């Protein structure tokens, strides 16, 4: 644990990137989190929503 200050910065940046990548898996109230599924399932008036 001598080099914890640099490893803390590396872990924080990697965890922020992992969280940002993980946030694509959330649908945020939509029917799906995949854009291609919405564009292939729905008409543009509701796919727009």
């Amino acid at each position: 644990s001598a080099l914890g200050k640099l490893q803390d910065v590396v872990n924080q940046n990697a965890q922020a990137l992992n969280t940002l990548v993980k946030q694509l898996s959330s649908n945020f109230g939509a029917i799906s989190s995949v854009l291609n599924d919405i564009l292939s399932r729905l008409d543009p008036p509701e796919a727009e929503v």
């Binding site: 008409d43 543009p44 008036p45 509701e46």
Partner: protein, 49 residues
């Protein structure tokens, strides 16, 4: 734009509708602005034969 259709087909003169005269007779855009006007014309556009 004036035409004569059935009584159940007046819901298809609208943005974002699926239907028959919407696809092959008269299509409205999704960003349509204006007013659709409909009134019964059984006394004028109908014959007993």
């Amino acid at each position: 734009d004036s035409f004569v259709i059935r009584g159940d087909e007046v819901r298809q003169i609208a943005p974002g509708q699926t239907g028959n005269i919407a696809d092959y007779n008269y299509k409205l855009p999704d960003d349509f602005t204006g007013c659709v006007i409909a009134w019964n014309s059984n006394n004028l556009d109908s014959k007993v034969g």
